Amino acid sequence: MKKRILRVTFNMPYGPEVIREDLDVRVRIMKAALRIQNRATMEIFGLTTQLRESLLSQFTAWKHRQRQVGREDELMIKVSVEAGYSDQGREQVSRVFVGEVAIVDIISPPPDIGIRIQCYTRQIDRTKTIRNMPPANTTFVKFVEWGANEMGLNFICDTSYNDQVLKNPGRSITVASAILASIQDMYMPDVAAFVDDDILIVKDRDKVIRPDEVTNVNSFVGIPSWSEWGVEFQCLFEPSIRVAGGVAVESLMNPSVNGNYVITALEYDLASRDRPFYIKVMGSPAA
Amino acid sequence: KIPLTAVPNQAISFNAGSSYWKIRLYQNMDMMNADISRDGVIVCHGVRCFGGIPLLQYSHQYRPDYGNFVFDRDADWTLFGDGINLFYLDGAEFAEYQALAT
Amino acid sequence: MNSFLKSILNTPTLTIRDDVTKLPVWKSLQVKKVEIYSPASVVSKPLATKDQTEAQVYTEALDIDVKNGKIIQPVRLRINAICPDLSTVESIMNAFNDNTSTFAITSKSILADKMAIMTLDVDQSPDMLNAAEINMEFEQVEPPVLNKFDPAFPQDSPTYGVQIQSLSDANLLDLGAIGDSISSAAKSLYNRV
């Protein structure tokens, strides 16, 4: 009888602080192929006075250390989420989200004090500015490369628009976050630009990033159905599912929807002491 | 090929070869028959079905650059999905097909 | 009323077997009742059909669609027993506190496999001055299977290798070296064999 695994890590100044699965933790994650950054809402129950003092005081949202030696971690702390199963002590954990805390709350009163937390991916860029002059007259791919270097992310770009000359592409960008909006703006809607985990991905709409890593899916909790753009279904926690990856679908109740699809949006509903432990997938026909 | 099923009268629609087709298959006394559509505009009515000969006979129908359909053996709606198939060939393949035919 | 003359094919003895060990457990119990529940869900909507075609074609329909609408829910099993000693009690409690415990229960002629304890009661009163009454309950973790898949004897396997998840880290333990580079340490570890 396999057990579920859910760890949440915080990179506090003294070191990591990992909330294990033994407590009551609920997490909802939404990811899509857009410029709007990913989000994660976290429910944490049973925190003692010691851990409340240690953690809740560091999501200040004011600024200390006006001299500002360095950047990044001297503004807001980072959170990483990994979920998976465990059988006979043999694990299959996988990472699903990286971000920084933005909003704090208190949800449930005593006797069980619970808090709610909002995290966003690459929110550190909303404060960091641009100190490297954007290219003046260049092609698309070099603009993408400059943006990737400026943000500090490994990038992959594969578009049919890779040999098109742009004039003054980024001469009106004030911070590091509008780079992505610039990249997406030029060639909507065929070109989709998004940031996933730590990788900036720019691609055509209907191209699978990794053609040889197609995950075959044949066991659906949520019956597949046509949904105006392709297919949409639901399953248990499958670590293989990613964004922009491909899926091969074979059904029983709905055998007319079999085919290859490219993943557009995802949703995670993972709990350690509640029923939901799911993944919702929407896809588009492969080109 | 084309997805089919064992029903005495049906119709399947698909987008193949940069073209929109709607085909109808139905039993008429002894042999089968077919209705082929494109653009939503009818092409032919009651095309008798034989094994190995193409469904579209007339030059202005099958291609300036379109394709054509061939049944490997004589159709029988009891056997669809098992031994009897319907295949689609794009323009170049159909051209070399007709070259090989004679 | 002689008992111990149990007829074959229906011997009313409750045998509980650990799923990984496959050895009988809690044979100190004296059970008094067993209940088995096997529910299912059936659609409750008017449903629609074509209903002007050939007879056997319509008989091919009204299947499948009826099949989509009957889905089986887990089996529920209940027993009632008296526990004479102590060791059985703490064994049951320890199995209860574990998240990863499964058992196969055998009634007179009904086999339920891959079960799990969900509810447990204990009662003590002057009606029994040296025993305790128990009320255990199980449900089926997963449904059974007949055939298929590829359980091969040897190393052969369906070779799941789903490991798209990682963040590479370089270690430091190896064997020795304080002021020596990684290449030197690796070469020395190699030459050790």
Added chain:
Amino acid sequence: MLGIFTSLLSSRSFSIVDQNTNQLVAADLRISRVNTRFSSVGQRHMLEDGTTKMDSRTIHPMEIIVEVFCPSIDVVDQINQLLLDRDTLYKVITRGMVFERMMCTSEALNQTPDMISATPARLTFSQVLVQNPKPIMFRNAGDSSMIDRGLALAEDVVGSAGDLFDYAVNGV
């Protein structure tokens, strides 16, 4: 229950018959009670003067509860198979009442000191509700309507062009 007066002596009480092959399943069942329940709900609207109007009534599937005794093992696993079946529709004939389109929805065996030889069981059936209860059938396969299958994929995955035709017309 009056009605039929047959004078046949050994008639038959409650029996489940398979509606596909006209076959009886679990014919050796000792039946004790049969309960049939009908249910409906009428939607009402609360008017202005002070009255209350009703506009329509909705009918739900009926339910049948049967209490039986199993005198062997074959009856027990026959009942288990009856419950697990997912495709067949069953017709139930009680004393004088005949029902159609039923599937088993429950089964509750029992094991007690009150009975050791047999096994008291309690089943439950529910009706499949369908519009147009009486179908219309044609005896000619060609003489039938047209089903509609919409917008599938050509699915490709085919060997070649010349070789398949040279197999199809040359014969090999």
Added chain:
Amino acid sequence: STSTIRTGTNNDILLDDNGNMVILRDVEACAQDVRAAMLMRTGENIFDVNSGVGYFEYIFSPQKSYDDARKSIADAILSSPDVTGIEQLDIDITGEVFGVDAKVITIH
């Protein structure tokens, strides 16, 4: 609400002296139509199989319950365009003669 052409003891068109087929109004048409329905027998209605009275499966053949014949006859009396419900059904079964009696309620 119902109308049909007169037939004799045989199921044949009967014409009056002047020779005009008479389109029966209600009531009489209901009785004639029910009588015709009860005699139709299963299986021989093209364009609608599974309609009729199953004589060779439920009555003439050796049976167990005789309930299926009763249900089939009750259905056959129904499905007429104007009939509403059944007041009585008997199924006598004396000797070899299989008696059937009924009294039908109509909207009029």
Added chain:
Amino acid sequence: STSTIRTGTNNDILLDDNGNMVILRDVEACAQDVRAAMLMRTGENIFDVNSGVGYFEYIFSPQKSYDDARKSIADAILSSPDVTGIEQLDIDITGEVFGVDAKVITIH
């Protein structure tokens, strides 16, 4: 709807006077299939563990209850393509023989 190649009382390929390998149709194919399935013995099939009848662990070994034999045999009779349900299993046990009788239910 299954099919198989006919075999003799010893599991060979049986050849007609014409010498033709024969593809048996349903029912008799089901009988041959179930007869061969009940004779498998467990631990003998490669690629599929836990398939067969535990003769050497449930019947031939000294056993207390003899319901395991019924379960294993009923399962091996199952897993065939067409078997629907099992009607009877008696297990006589007279003298040194282990009498087994079973009647199967088939879609056809």
